[PDB]
């Protein structure tokens, strides 16, 4: 792979990108609009520590921790937002 870099506002996710991230963290957006703020927050979360976005030779995007060599498909914080969605759903019930 190779690290993804921009080189030498546009970074705001689209409503459609937020919808898709919401589904990925377990929200049913049509039924649970009250949870969508977690999707808006989580989609722009920074990569922790020394994690960097990378793309392999087949074009697939993944995350690589250059400090320790760990790799994963999802953003490392996505599991935290999955957990918060479950807690927020229970809190509001």
């Amino acid at each position, epitope marked *: 792979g190779r690290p993804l870099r921009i080189g030498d506002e546009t*970074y705001i996710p689209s409503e459609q990108e937020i919808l898709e991230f919401a589904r990925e963290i377990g929200i049913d957006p049509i039924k649970e609009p009250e949870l969508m703020w977690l999707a808006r927050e989580g989609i722009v979360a920074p990569l922790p520590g020394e994690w960097k976005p990378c793309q392999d030779i*087949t*074009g697939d995007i993944y995350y690589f921790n250059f400090a320790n060599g760990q790799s994963m498909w999802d953003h490392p914080c996505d599991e935290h937002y999955r957990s918060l969605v479950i807690q927020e759903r229970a809190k509001l019930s």
Partner: nanobody, 122 residues
Framework: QVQLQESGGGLVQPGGSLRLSCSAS????????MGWYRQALGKQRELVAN???????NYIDSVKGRFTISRDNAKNMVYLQMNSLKPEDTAVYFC????????????????WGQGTQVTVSS
């Protein structure tokens, strides 16, 4: 929503030239890393060339110096100029958009066109 539509493929004589185009929708075009990938029948998808927002390019070794990737940011277009085409260039060619959510240390989303066939044949 970033959406890609490739065109310009088809049959081409060995040794010939061909330019592929891709139209991209969405507002994030100028910050995206745009690329061309190809998938030979029965094989994996493989980088052909890409170009990041700042214009840095990477090429797969087998096409370096025969192919050129370019972008027109005002028109939201990506292009692949191909020269000295060979039978092993036969594949479905896909345009790719890798979209950053942060200038550094962020999530990137990956978008694909449907592909256009290139067949290098006498």
């Amino acid at each position: 929503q970033v959406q890609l539509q490739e065109s310009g493929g088809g049959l081409v004589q060995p040794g010939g030239s061909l330019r592929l185009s891709c139209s991209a929708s969405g507002s994030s075009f100028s910050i995206n890393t745009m690329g061309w990938y190809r998938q030979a029948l029965g094989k994996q998808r493989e980088l052909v060339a890409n170009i990041n927002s700042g214009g840095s390019t990477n090429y797969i070794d087998s096409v370096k110096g025969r192919f050129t990737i370019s972008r027109d940011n005002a028109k939201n277009m990506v292009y692949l100029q191909m020269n000295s085409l060979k039978p092993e260039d036969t594949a479905v060619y896909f345009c790719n958009a890798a979209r950053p959510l942060r200038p550094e240390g962020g999530r990137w989303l990956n978008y694909w066109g449907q592909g256009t066939q290139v067949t290098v044949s006498s």
